[PDB]
């Protein structure tokens, strides 16, 4: 849809103009001329093991958007119970059964940033990491902190 491309363009600029961008919490780059792929970046939220880090996000707009959600993946490896430590695949309701057609790129980026500050270990993407979060919090932090240095520029 050209409705979908015009929309994505508008939401791209909405992120550009956002306060969260001017504070350098979130940003988005254009990848393809056609607006079907973007690259997001979120800062590690303060008082978490990601803090100091920056996380790139592959964002792909499927053909059935906006009736299906953007396909989002971490490019930057991260140690988090709701993100694959191997693939960056994300467990998050708004990317699945709680997607709503009126949700914006900005909404997605902010949700992912809140995801980083707020895990749901009883619905993991990475059961090893989630088991560690639950059973051994301190090893979980040290590891998340080292991944953030190693992979996220922390």
């Amino acid at each position: 849809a050209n409705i979908a491309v015009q929309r994505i363009k508008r939401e791209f600029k909405e992120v550009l103009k956002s306060e969260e961008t001017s504070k350098n919490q979130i940003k988005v780059d254009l990848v393809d001329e056609n607006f079907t792929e973007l690259r997001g970046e979120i800062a590690g939220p303060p008082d978490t093991p990601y803090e100091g880090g920056r996380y790139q996000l592959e964002i792909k707009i499927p053909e059935t958007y906006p009736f299906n959600p953007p396909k989002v993946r971490f490019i930057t490896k991260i140690w988090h119970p709701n993100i694959s430590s191997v693939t960056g695949a994300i467990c998050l309701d708004i990317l699945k059964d709680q997607w709503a057609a009126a949700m914006t790129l900005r909404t997605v980026l902010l949700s992912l940033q809140a995801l980083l500050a707020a895990a749901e270990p009883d619905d993991p993407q990475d059961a090893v990491v989630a088991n560690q979060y639950k059973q051994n919090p301190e090893m979980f932090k040290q590891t998340a902190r080292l991944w953030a240095h190693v992979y996220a520029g922390a």
Binding site: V5, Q6, K9, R10, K13
Partner: protein, 77 residues
């Protein structure tokens, strides 16, 4: 007042009553409103030159039944 036809690439022709000494701001916003798209998402031409918000039919030499051509913006606004 003067009738003016606004034509899109689909070749739709939508008619407007417009005051001679009044900003084309209104026309442009009313059109975008009719079509449900943001203003700044479309540009409007008369004789191959873009209308501006400050422009009026007073200037531009705009007549009865005269046509304005509307196009989508690359940015999309």
């Amino acid at each position: 007042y003067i009738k003016l036809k606004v034509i899109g690439q689909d070749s739709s022709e939508i008619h407007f009553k417009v005051k001679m000494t009044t900003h084309l701001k209104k026309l442009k916003e009313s059109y975008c409103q009719r079509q449900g798209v943001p203003m700044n998402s479309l540009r409007f031409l008369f004789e191959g030159q873009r209308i501006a918000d400050n422009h009026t039919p007073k200037e531009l030499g705009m007549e009865e039944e005269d046509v304005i051509e509307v196009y989508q913006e690359q940015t999309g606004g």
